[PDB]
Design a protein around this ligand. Sequence first.
Ligand SMILES: Nc1ncnc2c1ncn2[C@@H]1O[C@H](COP(=O)(O)OP(=O)(O)O)[C@@H](O)[C@H]1O
Length: 190
Amino acid sequence: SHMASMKHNINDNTLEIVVGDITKETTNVIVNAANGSLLGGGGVDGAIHHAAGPELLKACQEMRNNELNGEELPTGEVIITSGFQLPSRFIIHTVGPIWNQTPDLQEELLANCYRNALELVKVKKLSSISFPSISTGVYGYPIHEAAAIALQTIIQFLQENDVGLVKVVLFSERDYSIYQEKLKYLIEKI
Ligand SMILES: Nc1ncnc2c1ncn2[C@@H]1O[C@H](COP(=O)(O)OP(=O)(O)O)[C@@H](O)[C@H]1O
């Protein structure tokens, strides 16, 4: 099947948007739009658990019990695990905002997912990362607004930092089309 894609170079970095299944990406890191409980759900988190195999859930729950001391992973924060059966080396787990639960903070919190994940890529001297459309499925964040926040945040980070390749993997042509129109718009302002 055809997979729409476009790329833009930002200094020595490359930002790519693509249609695809994030579990098939061979980037160093893939990002899971995780649940706060770090339990496996449906959606992209469910896909990632199914593709990674049963060691993922076990790893995440060990991390919940130890470094998080039974607390939920806070919105906009990150943890990192191995990739297990995924073709990536690592999975960065992040929790996006649930749409309009916290209206005053949710733009910042969504941005935090991207910023915190990208800083962690830098810290570990990894050079490629794939993001899904965080919060625009069951979490209900309007795709038109989320895409703006995701892209602005990524573009800003890549303007100030050497990372390598950042991919956003969209699961539908509609989401890709929105991302494409937003990315083209933001490129024009640079
Ligand atoms: N295998 C997959 N690869 C990439 N994206 C996916 C996959 N499965 C679902 N998605 C997309 O991930 C986005 C977030 O959906 P969801 O998993 O419900 O996350 P959230 O709970 O953060 O909204 C949605 O656009 C959904 O279509």
